[PDB]
């Protein structure tokens, strides 16, 4: 019963970190319930191409935020041994709650 909310801009990085957490918790904890997709938050930005009038191009971009919901059950006292300091990813934020 520990809420884990991962958030990031790269899906490969979040997925790799989630699989790392799952493999580090399987050997030391109980049957992990795996990650949940937690649908993406997309924020778009439409910006005129040219610095002057040229109104009908607009070349819009997007920024997506992906989330993960590992949510390990049975927070065994042996699980945090392989956890809480073992991480490759950099551009990934982690949320932990009880």
């Amino acid at each position: 019963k520990i809420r884990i909310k991962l958030r990031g801009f790269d899906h490969k990085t979040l997925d790799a970190s989630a699989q790392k957490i799952v493999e580090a918790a399987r050997r030391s904890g109980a049957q992990v319930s795996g990650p949940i997709p937690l649908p993406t938050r997309v924020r778009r930005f439409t910006v005129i191409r040219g610095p002057f009038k040229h109104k009908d191009s607009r070349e819009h971009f997007e920024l997506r935020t992906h989330n993960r919901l590992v949510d390990i059950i049975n927070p065994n006292r042996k699980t945090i041994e392989q956890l809480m300091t073992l991480d490759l990813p950099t551009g990934v934020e982690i949320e932990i709650k009880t």
Partner: protein, 60 residues
């Protein structure tokens, strides 16, 4: 983007309504996105240069 207008940054704008937002990079006044703090032109430039994490070209 006149230099004197870069006085926009002001702890004492004398009023809340007078406080507007400018582009921190080029000093623009219009089309200033609040999320990035830049204008639209600097947004496009720094997005092309890859200096904005997670910003990608949209297509659907």
């Amino acid at each position: 983007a006149r230099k004197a207008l870069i006085e926009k940054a002001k702890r004492t704008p004398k009023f809340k309504v007078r406080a507007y937002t400018r582009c921190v990079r080029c000093g623009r006044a219009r089309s200033v996105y609040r999320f990035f703090g830049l204008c639209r032109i600097c947004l496009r430039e720094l997005a092309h240069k890859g200096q904005l994490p997670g910003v990608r070209k949209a297509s659907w």
